[model samples]
Target: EEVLFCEKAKLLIFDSGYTSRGVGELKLLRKKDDKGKVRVLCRSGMGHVLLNTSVVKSFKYQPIDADNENLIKWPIITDGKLETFIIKVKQKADGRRLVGAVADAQQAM
Candidate 1:
């Protein structure tokens, strides 16, 4: 299962599934799990601009080499070129902290 989260457009694309619940700038993507249950991947923080062919040429579908503990990167092709984007999952919990660090830094300033 692969997921592409576009930050610029705030969209989620499930490479292996589908959805139909968006209008104009707001769009959502969903897919079925291994148990054959449907799941909503993105309800908000999503946009329709990424669906435009003029901006996105194709999907590279390549693997990224990185520490799987807290961060991951995905390579994609946009405007006929390749680019990599980072995806971080839950840095605040499980020894990987970030939620309070920014607050602490701001308070120190």
Candidate 2:
């Protein structure tokens, strides 16, 4: 986990966990610093905002795939932006990393 602050708009990318437990929400607060550098602030495992899903015009998953098994999938908005979405997990309980088709930009809206 890391935290950064700036005075301008910045892009931050995060990888969703490859399991069902990886489901989470993101809270982003854009702010600027005295140095004039744009910064995008956001933290995972935070509170939630009740935005209507119906208003969502489209839904795209991350790292597109077929017959996904124990993979994480995030949703992208109409603005061509991706956010923390739900992750699907396998029923078996093992620490081993499972590889599956991750929803990609082409598949995820």
Candidate 3:
């Protein structure tokens, strides 16, 4: 199927724990693996792959800079490490679906 979710906002990836691997147009997909398993994927520009994460049962999210409520971050555990990313969102706004929507996307599989 086409992307299961679509939203756009600045996306930050810290491959250096600070710089971006890629960012935004935020497409989330339920992809089929070699063995027909579902993999949760996140994409940015035409060819940039931001998240090729394994679909797992546990997810973690946190408020940044002591609950700025203006921004947020979430993690994808891979290679025994959580990828560092910061996304702009709101506690009382429309663009805050990043986490909950994708978090819920994992359940759609």
Candidate 4:
């Protein structure tokens, strides 16, 4: 299922398998049999993968200071076109992140 954006009714479909990489590594304590001690284990096993594409809305791009100084070019879209949007990549809790710039559509601009 695709999520609805407030600006337009564009639909986006994502693979459920791809979403599993997001929350599969939840840690929980589990008791061990050999020793009367508890061990930290990933509670949410890799099998319990759940992907909710509907939750995703949109993306934004933000340029990194370093990239701007270096005059680096980033791709907005993977399409074979240099006109695609580009921005400096950011890091999130998972050690990596992606965000888009805040710009209105052509009509809005």
Candidate 5:
């Protein structure tokens, strides 16, 4: 599933912490035929915040590695600026990576 969004769309990160870092659910909300929302669970320590997509003009993502850890350098545009949203995931005993789940979540979007 590809993560989809719209201009001025908002993404709320409800938590942020080591324990909650890669632990959470990602849900896609459909408001219209072509518009929707991206909901994600955040770390317990971190409060939720609105991700303003209106300032975002461009974005990209690429795999980094596979092993005890997986990484993705997700570069995006916001406020007419360039930024990288680095996504990191710890490898699980089931041979799954949190990043993979994240990708799946995005795909569902």
Candidate 6:
């Protein structure tokens, strides 16, 4: 397994389907044996994972607000349903990198 991207990010509770827990290492991982598959994962201390899903081309990524480029709103499919994931990084550049990694992963898939 290889990490394509890693950064500190936020997992908001609004539509993320999780509660109370936030702030974790958000990462995109590539598995060389599985057609170089990639997945998005977010975990806090003690390995508490708040978000986990594959980034399909169907996903929609955008900033929650025009004034807040550091945060992103993602609508993705998981567990046979659609869920909106709210995430952010320390800087806009980092967030963009993570987003870009997911995009690249889609191509690899």
- The digit string of per-residue lDDT tens for model 3 on 3-104 reads 655655455666525555555555545545422233445566485666665545575554565545435565666578776566553342423454565556
Worst 10-residue stretch by lDDT in candidate 6? Answer: 12-21
Candidates in order, TM-scores: namely: 0.28, 0.24, 0.56, 0.16, 0.38, 0.79
> Per-residue lDDT of 29-86 in model 5, one digit per residue for the tens?
3334432343332232243432222211133344534443344444555586666554
Off by over 4 Å in 1: 1-68, 91-109
Which of candidates 2 and 6 is the stronger one according to lDDT? 6
Q: Which stretches of candidate 6 lie over 4 Å from their true place?
A: 15-20, 78-81
Cα deviation of 9, candidate 5, in Å? 22
Candidates 2 and 4 compared: the better one by TM-score is 2
Candidate achieving the largest TM-score:
6
Higher-ranked by lDDT: 1 or 2: 1
List lDDT for all candidates, in order. 0.29, 0.28, 0.53, 0.22, 0.35, 0.74
Better of 3 and 6 by lDDT: 6
The digit string of per-residue lDDT tens for model 2 on 53-99 reads: 32122433332344443332445454666565433333312101211
Candidate 1 lands at a TM-score of: 0.28
> Would you list the rank order by TM-score, best first?
6, 3, 5, 1, 2, 4
RMSD in Å for all candidates: 15.1, 15.1, 4.5, 18.3, 8.7, 2.9
Candidate 3 clashes: the total is 0
Off by over 4 Å in 5: 1-43, 46-58, 65-69, 92-109
- Candidate 6 has which clashing residue pairs, if any? none
Clash number for model 4? 7
